[PDB]
From a paper:
Anion exchanger 3 (AE3) is pivotal in regulating intracellular pH across excitable tissues, yet its structural intricacies and functional dynamics remain underexplored compared to other anion exchangers. This study unveils the structural insights into human AE3, including the cryo-electron microscopy structures for AE3 transmembrane domains (TMD) and a chimera combining AE3 N-terminal domain (NTD) with AE2 TMD (hAE3NTD2TMD).
The structure of hAE3 in the presence of HCO3− and HCO3−/DIDS, and without HCO3− supplementation were determined with C2 symmetry, reaching overall resolutions of 2.7 Å, 2.7 Å, and 2.9 Å, respectively. In all three cryo-EM structures, hAE3 TMD consistently adopts an outward-facing conformation, demonstrating a high degree of structural conservation compared to human AE1 and AE2 in their respective outward-facing conformations. In the hAE3-DIDS structure, the cryo-EM density map of DIDS extends continuously to the sidechain of K842, indicating a covalent linking. Viewed from the extracellular side, DIDS is positioned near the outer vestibule’s exit/entrance atop the HCO3− anion, effectively obstructing the pathway between the substrate-binding site and the extracellular environment. Structural analysis of DIDS-contacting residues reveals that the core stilbene framework is encircled by hydrophobic residues such as L772/729, F726/835/1181, V773, and I831, which facilitate hydrophobic interactions stabilizing DIDS. Interestingly, the residue K1173, a potential reactive site, appears unbonded with DIDS, as indicated by its separate density. In contrast, in the hAE3HCO3−/DIDS structure, the distance between the sulfonic acid groups of DIDS and the bicarbonate ion exceeds 5.4 Å, allowing for their simultaneous presence within the outer vestibule. The increased vulnerability may stem from the predominant outward-facing conformation of AE3 under various tested pH and anion conditions, which renders its DIDS-binding site more accessible from the extracellular milieu.
Author numbering:
A (entry chain A), B (entry chain B): 673 to 859, 884 to 1210
Write the structure that this text describes.
């Protein structure tokens, strides 16, 4: 019962520490195997590229005040610290879209009001630290028990769908950069090149298909058990290596490759330095902003809380075989304090990543080798340790001095890897199965509790409600009011706890929503 | 059994006619369904393109004396006649590689000895007719009982492997004429075009994958049974239509398309006419060639007999549920007489096609709708009728006046269709399963009679012997002694009936070889 209120200050944090910290030698010892290496290799590529993309976008939006190096430094430091001190070291911290939206809006507000951007960020971080400490002190992390699988399913489905849509847009943009033309006259990124877009499509599809086939090969009967396990562990590294070699063999055509800033330096050394004075560099900071910086701190707190808590709820589900423990009080305090302290150095705030953490947990899941003939395998154990997160964060940080190797890796292989990750992420959601059940006839439905105890027409209405909520949420972030997305997401708890029982019966709700 | 000798002249032919001909109204009536349309649409494309390819090759080899229109006319006429009068109307007649080799060798011999080519072909055809009549009269078609599944599996495996290899050398060739170049300066088939090879590869892979996925969709649970059956029947037409539409949407890039001669005319109207005088056109024909034309007739008879009889053996296997009957005496007489009469008009000889007939039978197989969960589907029936062959031959003949539609179909879609056909053809051979069994561990082998009653190491030796025979046969036709391939193939019957019992036991041979 980690969500029970004790009535004493710092009680939940004390319970979390006392529950988790004794297992530390086990955490250090569990990581000696070959699956951890494959997980590290996969998740390092899964985590490095979003840093580059969001650093480029941030540099575009904030006129070069924050760039790629800032995001890389923040990711490395925060990930290392959280993995070393967290109670759930299987979470992956990084930048996300809502944080980018908030940063852009805050930059617009600061520019409109003739204020300094980084000093305002500093005071926002300080107020966020104060608010997070106050919230943790009052055991405010017990509201998580009010978050039903309704909201969790909606959030996960929307996040994975958005992830998938963005990979396809970045391929489309390749083809508009390099259209297929009848004539290519002979001649600052290259433009209007032949054989580029089709080769990128081929590389993406090949990487995806090799990864899928090697994943399917695990449950076959060919070769020995040890060889099957080893080959299935390293399916994604094998796909990446094979497609990189295929791309390297062809030396006539231009393909876009990974680029990283070289050296540890700020993006714009003339405009700013590493340390941001809290009282102002060129102008005094007015005290009224010093006082009024609480509201953006409140918005950041709401964003970080909702994201981290929903991710922690999804990761620690009972069907996923999580044993060593869970952290609902320590992780929030760690993330909030580190984010608030990051403001003094002009570094962006971070949160828990949903797709990356889910993929990290999936990569470490061990299935039973005694697979029943013609039966779906079941989870044997999940390996819990602290080495993988530290190694991933260290590699992300050290990627700055490893640009020579990274310049040989095309982006289409990473596009295929992202497609594989997004497709795999959608298979662990009950909404996916209840959406597949719509196409099949009613006489072929499995023996799930929401099939036998609920009428067929009364079960499809729940799925329709969830789909409508997801569509409304996507429509709202598409527009310019995307800053109100978290409030709209938290609004689904009153909907389930006040309006849903008025339509459905308690028995139906107990089986459908569990 | 139809393989028993009666002791009277024309006894086997009389028995075959009396067994098969009463079912004629059933043969005409069985064709009223939707699967026949899909089979016709698939096999028409399966049959038309080899005529074009072999017509081009024949025109190259014979200096334009025989071309594409001659092959089309021969295919149409012989197919229509055989389907109307045959006892096994599920066979598909057409040109093959061995026939091309014989024609090239005969042309070389005629050129070296200063003789006319078509008159020699006329006399070869007449001697072939005489030999076929003599062989059929003496009940010589009872030697087919000495052809064990050893030879049948060897032949089928080799033929399918060659088919697949040739589909990948015509894409390699497609890439070779259109290499990927850094620069494409603007400047008789087009050459050195951009975006052609990669687009052809994409079209091939897309057609193959759509066909495979739609074939897999048959055994799923989505949608109703009727919709599943209808969609699975038309998987290959749907793949072809979708990929043709995709290619048509892109109008910037050059792709090679189907071309057919227009009008009904001889390839070289100046050199020859439709009728070949048997006494000589420009020079008298020496009687010594008139007498000595028996040996090439013997070679042609051996080739046609072996190919047609092996194909008929493979098609009429007991596991394939053939009911209306089989023809071992009527089909040989029909094919031999029609081929011999074809010589007078300067048309090439035809034989039964293995891959095309196997695909034709597979396309008309009906599987039981009561599919057991987690179990292989069972064959319910095979639709035996005469309409499909007549329609396919008529369409092949009429394709001359339908070039406008045919010019919009790229060849890469057909390459993908050929790959699908070749892959599907290899799944009905026991050698395929016994070759898959090598990779799997000995504790996972099924309960087939060649597993339980034979030691594991003693069964792998039979597969090695078969593979060595196949490799030797392929090596022999690669070289210039490919005219002796049929003799080498028939040499495998003494090997099985004289040498194999000296090594294996009676029980081992009975279990391993049917
Ligand atoms: O976070 S994602 O990995 O899906 C992502 C990937 C790319 N490119 C390939 S790494 C580009 C953008 C995104 C995230 C886009 C996004 C997601 C959620 C929200 N919520 C807004 S309240 C907003 C965005 S936004 O950046 O398009 O505004
Ligand atoms: O008969 S096939 O459909 O495999 C074929 C197809 C193509 N091109 C695409 S339709 C080209 C050639 C062939 C057949 C080649 C062949 C097959 C068997 C033999 N054995 C007789 S000794 C010989 C040949 S050959 O034409 O290469 O000599």
């Amino acid at each position: 019962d980690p969500l029970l209120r004790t009535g004493s200050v710092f009680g939940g944090l004390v319970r979390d520490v006392r529950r988790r910290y004794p297992h530390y030698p086990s955490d250090l010892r569990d990581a000696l195997h070959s699956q951890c290496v494959a997980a590290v290799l996969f998740i390092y590529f899964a985590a490095l590229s979003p840093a580059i993309t969001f650093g480029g976008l941030l540099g575009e939006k904030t006129e070069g005040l924050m760039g790629v190096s800032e995001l890389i430094v923040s990711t490395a430091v925060l990930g290392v610290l959280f993995s070393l001190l967290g109670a759930q070291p299987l979470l992956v911290v990084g930048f996300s879209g809502p944080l980018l939206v908030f940063e852009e809006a805050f930059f617009k507000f600061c520019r409109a009001q003739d204020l300094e951007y980084l000093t305002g960020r500093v005071w926002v971080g300080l107020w966020l630290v104060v608010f997070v400490l106050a919230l943790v002190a009052a055991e405010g992390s017990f509201l998580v028990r009010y978050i039903s699988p309704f909201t969790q399913e909606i959030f996960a489905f929307l996040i994975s769908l958005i992830f998938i849509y963005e990979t396809f847009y970045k391929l489309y943009k390749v083809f508009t950069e390099h259209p297929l033309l009848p004539f290519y006259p002979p001649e600052p990124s290259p433009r209007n090149q032949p054989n580029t877009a089709l080769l990128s499509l081929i590389l993406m599809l090949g990487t995806f298909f090799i990864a899928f086939f090697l994943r399917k090969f695990r449950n076959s009967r060919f070769l020995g058990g040890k060889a099957r396990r080893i080959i299935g562990d390293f399916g994604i590294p094998i796909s990446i290596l094979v497609m990189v070699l295929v791309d390297y063999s062809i030396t006539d055509t231009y393909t876009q490759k990974l680029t990283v800033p070289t050296g540890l330096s700020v993006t714009s050394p003339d405009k700013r330095s590493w340390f941001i004075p809290p009282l102002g560099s060129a102008r005094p900071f007015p005290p009224w902003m010093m006082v009024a910086a609480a509201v953006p701190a409140l918005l950041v707190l709401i964003l970080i809380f909702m994201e981290t808590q929903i991710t922690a709820l999804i990761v620690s589900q009972k069907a996923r075989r999580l044993l060593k423990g869970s952290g609902f009080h320590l992780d929030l305090l760690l993330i909030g304090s580190l984010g608030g302290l990051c403001g003094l150095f002009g570094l962006p705030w971070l949160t828990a990543a949903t797709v990356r953490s889910v993929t990290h947990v999936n990569a470490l899941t061990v299935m039973r080798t005694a697979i029943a003939p013609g039966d779906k395998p079941q989870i044997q154990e999940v390996r819990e340790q602290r080495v993988t997160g530290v190694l991933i964060a260290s590699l992300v940080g050290l990627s700055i001095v490893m640009g020579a190797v990274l310049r040989r890796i095309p982006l289409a292989v990473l596009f295929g890897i992202f497609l594989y990750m997004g497709v795999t992420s959608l298979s662990g959601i009950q909404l996916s199965q209840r959406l597949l059940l719509i196409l099949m006839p009613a006489k072929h439905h499995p023996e799930q509790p929401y099939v036998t105890k609920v009428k067929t027409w009364r079960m499809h209405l729940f799925t329709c409600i969830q789909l409508g909520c997801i569509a409304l949420l996507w429509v709202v972030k598409s527009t310019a009011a995307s800053l109100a997305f978290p409030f709209l997401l938290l609004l689904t708890v009153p909907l389930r706890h006040c309006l849903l029982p008025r339509l459905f019966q308690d028995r139906e709700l107990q089986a459908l929503d569990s």
